[PDB]
Amino acid sequence: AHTLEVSRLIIGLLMTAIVLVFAAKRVLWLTKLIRSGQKTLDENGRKNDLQKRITTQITEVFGQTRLLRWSVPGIAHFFTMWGFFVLASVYLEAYGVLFDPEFHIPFIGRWPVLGFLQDFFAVAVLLGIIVFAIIRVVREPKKIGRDSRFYGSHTGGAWEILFMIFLVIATYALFRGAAVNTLGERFPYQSGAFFSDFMAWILRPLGATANMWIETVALMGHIGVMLVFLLIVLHSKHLHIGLAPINVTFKRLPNGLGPLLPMESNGEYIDFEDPAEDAVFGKGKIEDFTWKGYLDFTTCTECGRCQSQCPAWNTGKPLSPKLVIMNLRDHMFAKAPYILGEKPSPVPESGFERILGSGPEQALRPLVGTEEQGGVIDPDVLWSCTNCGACVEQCPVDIEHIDHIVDMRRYQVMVESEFPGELGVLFKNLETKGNPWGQNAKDRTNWIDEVDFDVPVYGEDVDSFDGFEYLFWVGCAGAYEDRAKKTTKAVAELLATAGVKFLVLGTGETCTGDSARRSGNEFLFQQLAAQNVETINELFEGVETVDRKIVVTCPHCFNTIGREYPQLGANYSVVHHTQLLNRLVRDKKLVPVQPVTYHDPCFLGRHNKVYEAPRELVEASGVTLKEMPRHADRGLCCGAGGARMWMEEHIGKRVNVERTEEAMDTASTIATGCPFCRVMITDGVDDVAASRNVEKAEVLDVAQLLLNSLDTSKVTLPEKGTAAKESEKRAAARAEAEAKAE
Ligand code: HEM
Ligand SMILES: CCCCCCCCCCCCO[C@@H]1O[C@H](CO)[C@@H](O[C@H]2O[C@H](CO)[C@@H](O)[C@H](O)[C@H]2O)[C@H](O)[C@H]1O
Numbered sequence: 001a002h003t004l005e006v007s008r009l010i011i012g013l014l015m016t017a018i019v020l021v022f023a024a025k026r027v028l029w030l031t032k033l034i035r036s037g038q039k040t041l042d043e044n045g046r047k048n049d050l051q052k053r054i055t056t057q058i059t060e061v062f063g064q065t066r067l068l069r070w071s072v073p074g075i076a077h078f079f080t081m082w083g084f085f086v087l088a089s090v091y092l093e094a095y096g097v098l099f100d101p102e103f104h105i106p107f108i109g110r111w112p113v114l115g116f117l118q119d120f121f122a123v124a125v126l127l128g129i130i131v132f133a134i135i136r137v138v139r140e141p142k143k144i145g146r147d148s149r150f151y152g153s154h155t156g157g158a159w160e161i162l163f164m165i166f167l168v169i170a171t172y173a174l175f176r177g178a179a180v181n182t183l184g185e186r187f188p189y190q191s192g193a194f195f196s197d198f199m200a201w202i203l204r205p206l207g208a209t210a211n212m213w214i215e216t217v218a219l220m221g222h223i224g225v226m227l228v229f230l231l232i233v234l235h236s237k238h239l240h241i242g243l244a245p246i247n248v249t250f251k252r253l254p255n256g257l258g259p260l261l262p263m264e265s266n267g268e269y270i271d272f273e274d275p276a277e278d279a280v281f282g283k284g285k286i287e288d289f290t291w292k293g294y295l296d297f298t299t300c301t302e303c304g305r306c307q308s309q310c311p312a313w314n315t316g317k318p319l320s321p322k323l324v325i326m327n328l329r330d331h332m333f334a335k336a337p338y339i340l341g342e343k344p345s346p347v348p349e350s351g352f353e354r355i356l357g358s359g360p361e362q363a364l365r366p367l368v369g370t371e372e373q374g375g376v377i378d379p380d381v382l383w384s385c386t387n388c389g390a391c392v393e394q395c396p397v398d399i400e401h402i403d404h405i406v407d408m409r410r411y412q413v414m415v416e417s418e419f420p421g422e423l424g425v426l427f428k429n430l431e432t433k434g435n436p437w438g439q440n441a442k443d444r445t446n447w448i449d450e451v452d453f454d455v456p457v458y459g460e461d462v463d464s465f466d467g468f469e470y471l472f473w474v475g476c477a478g479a480y481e482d483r484a485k486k487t488t489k490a491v492a493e494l495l496a497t498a499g500v501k502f503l504v505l506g507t508g509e510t511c512t513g514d515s516a517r518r519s520g521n522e523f524l525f526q527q528l529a530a531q532n533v534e535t536i537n538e539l540f541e542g543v544e545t546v547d548r549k550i551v552v553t554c555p556h557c558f559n560t561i562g563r564e565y566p567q568l569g570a571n572y573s574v575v576h577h578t579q580l581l582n583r584l585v586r587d588k589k590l591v592p593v594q595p596v597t598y599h600d601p602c603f604l605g606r607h608n609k610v611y612e613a614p615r616e617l618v619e620a621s622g623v624t625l626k627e628m629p630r631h632a633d634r635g636l637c638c639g640a641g642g643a644r645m646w647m648e649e650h651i652g653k654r655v656n657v658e659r660t661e662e663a664m665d666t667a668s669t670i671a672t673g674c675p676f677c678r679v680m681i682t683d684g685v686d687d688v689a690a691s692r693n694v695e696k697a698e699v700l701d702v703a704q705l706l707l708n709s710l711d712t713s714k715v716t717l718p719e720k721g722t723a724a725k726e727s728e729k730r731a732a733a734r735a736e737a738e739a740k741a742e
């Protein structure tokens with residue numbers, strides 16, 4: 001009897017002490033690795049607005065708002081997660097019982113309610129394991145292939161952890177029954193605890209004689225399994241247990257979408273007019289990723305939520321947001337001895353596994369390189385991204401895939417000088433003519449000559465911004481592209497009908513650089529953005545920050561002029577034409593008098609969270625809006641973002657074709673909100689219709705749908721030169737008033 005009395009403590013304590021040495025030896029090692037990355041300046045090192053960071057950390061972690069969006073797995077994880085917190089109380093009882101069998105949680109160790117929660121969660125976690133187990137059996141990668149949410153994931157490590165949770169419950173159940181039989185009335189939860197009472201009933205026949213050994217065997221298993229399970233987690237892909245709460249603390253706010261962060265080197269922003277000799281552009285090796293970058297890599301849960309939504313992955317291309325993180329994460333660990341200084345420096349779509357081990361070959365691999373180069377990330381993976389944002393919008397742990405993808409592009413374009421040959425034409429056209437098409441700058445104001453109403457042009461006829469409300473910014477697409485130019489005229493006509501006083505910079509405009517920045521060429525973007533910020537700033541001289549209004553017809557201008565120029569000192573209030581037109585129809589300025597489908601632009605919908613305004617215009621125009629199977633924040637890319645408009649799709653199905661086939665199945669009329677969405681979808685309709693041998697679907701812009709519904713017969717738009725005459729009158733009147741006074 002006494003042998004079991006003391007043996008419980010002798011085995012229990014040494015197991016804890018021995019394991020905590022190994023467990024604590026790796027916690028320092030992981031910390032020594034995650035903190036070995038480059039430091040960060042963004043948001044004061046991801047520390048500004050601290051109070052709001054824990055506010056989202058608690059809501060996203062404990063509330064699981066970010067995670068419950070996927071119903072079946074999120075709900076199961078909710079009980080799996082909260083169970084761990086509750087079962088933590090059990091381990092306190094188990095450890096204390098070693099010192100004395102009468103031990104119980106002093107303050108609450110006999111409260112009947114706490115027993116119900118432990119028992120309720122003791123089986124709720126069991127369901128969580130089953131629900132997770134069923135999903136992987138149904139979605140088996142070997143049975144489904146690339147369509148599987150778990151393709152490329154390490155299935156071996158996922159089942160290993162699920163098995164250990166089962167043992168913890170199985171050992172937990174055995175202890176509860178054994179404890180009741182041995183302790184009897186002295187058992188802490190003598191009342192309630194149905195799951196603990198249930199076990200005692202089945203274990204009762206063995207009697208107190210047998211259960212004396214069962215309790216000790218069960219207990220040592222409960223502590224032993226946990227300690228053995230603790231070591232597995234630290235050395236397994238399950239690291240998101242402790243890192244996930246931290247990766248959400250330092251998350252990019254409000255989300256990992258929107259503007260592209262300025263480049264920094266070793267904790268300092270790069271001065272592009274005087275970059276330092278040691279300045280590093282982009283990220284050409286795993287050591288260039290910041291300490292936050294390493295945290296993202298290790299926090300990946302390999303859930304595949306991002307992968308199931310990637311336009312590139314689902315159209316047959318090697319790119320996968322999951323595998324990019326996994327390949328970077330695995331490369332990070334494989335190269336760890338060289339990063340930490342321990343050694344002196346010397347599935348087919350998963351690029352890391354091309355070179356394995358931590359030998360010298362791992363240290364010499366390019367971060368981005370073809371198979372013959374052994375690179376971790378194939379160039380087709382890197383250049384297949386469209387910057388749609390489906391991965392970032394979907395990550396429960398806020399990994400910000402786009403930041404890593406375009407930070408690697410920055411190295412290729414700006415340092416390595418390697419990029420698809422189709423971007424070479426883009427950069428030469430932008431840097432010589434100011435537009436990606438390479439057309440003459442003098443032809444920018446041609447679209448003004450093709451309309452029959454007055455569109456004042458700053459510098460050309462009107463000398464100042466006085467008396468005007470909005471700067472209408474067209475962009476290269478709205479001035480040079482035949483189909484996009486159609487929308488620009490419609491928007492200008494709508495504003496004139498609504499009476500909004502506006503002007504256009506005309507030939508003083510140049511490319512914003514959204515394609516230039518997201519292709520990785522930030523030398524070009526800073527060269528183009530600086531010209532636009534300076535050009536616009538002169539227009540708004542003497543204009544209060546509130547009145548510095550801009551209206552754009554492209555989500556990319558909306559995203560760049562509004563969110564990325566402020567990094568250069570801008571304070572512009574830019575609004576997409578759908579928002580401006582929506583509140584004009586709201587304000588009864590515009591009076592509109594079979595089904596239609598709307599394609600959400602990823603830079604309008606997903607990045608800038610503009611969903612209701614474009615759809616209200618569609619409804620206000622009298623047509624019936626039919627949502628696609630994939631729409632709103634789960635919309636699909638047409639393949640135009642991230643400079644993919646200028647490259648060519650060699651691999652797999654064409655993204656615009658996949659979207660168009662879905663769009664045409666929904667309705668025969670498609671409404672878009674971007675110059676590039678219209679071009680891609682319109683081109684896709686030509687391919688899809690020809691393949692299907694059916695009449696082409698009508699692709700229009702939400703501005704054109706609104707205009708067609710207006711009864712413009714009663715409206716007389718301003719005659720050409722009307723704004724010029726007013727400018728002369730105001731200028732002449734002011735001159736006369738001052739001349740006659742002085
Ligand atoms: C705090 C205790 C936690 C426990 C005990 C726990 C446990 C688990 C386990 C065992 C899985 C495997 C699911 C499967 O194999 O299908 C899982 C999945 C996951 N966990 Fe946790 N986790 C915890 C914390 C967190 C937190 C705070 C987050 C924050 C986002 C998180 C995010 C995820 C995600 C995204 C998945 C993937 C779910 C899926 O594949 O559908 N975990 N968790
Ligand atoms: C069961 C799983 C167990 C997981 C075990 C491993 C845990 C790893 C913990 C490390 C977490 C990252 O820890 C993070 O490190 C960074 C990098 O220095 C610190 O960063 C801090 O110092 C750096 C420089 O040293 C500054 O640039 C930064 O502005 C400042 O915040 C963060 O304050 C800290 O939050």
Ligand code: SF4
Pocket residue numbers: 299300301302303304305306307321322325394395396397398399
């Ligand atoms: S990157 Fe995020 S969404 Fe994708 S598998 Fe990893 S944890 Fe899941």
Ligand code: SF4
Pocket residue numbers: 306309310311312313319320321384385386387388389390391392401402
């Ligand atoms: S941004 Fe879109 S295309 Fe790029 S990796 Fe993420 S999901 Fe794929």
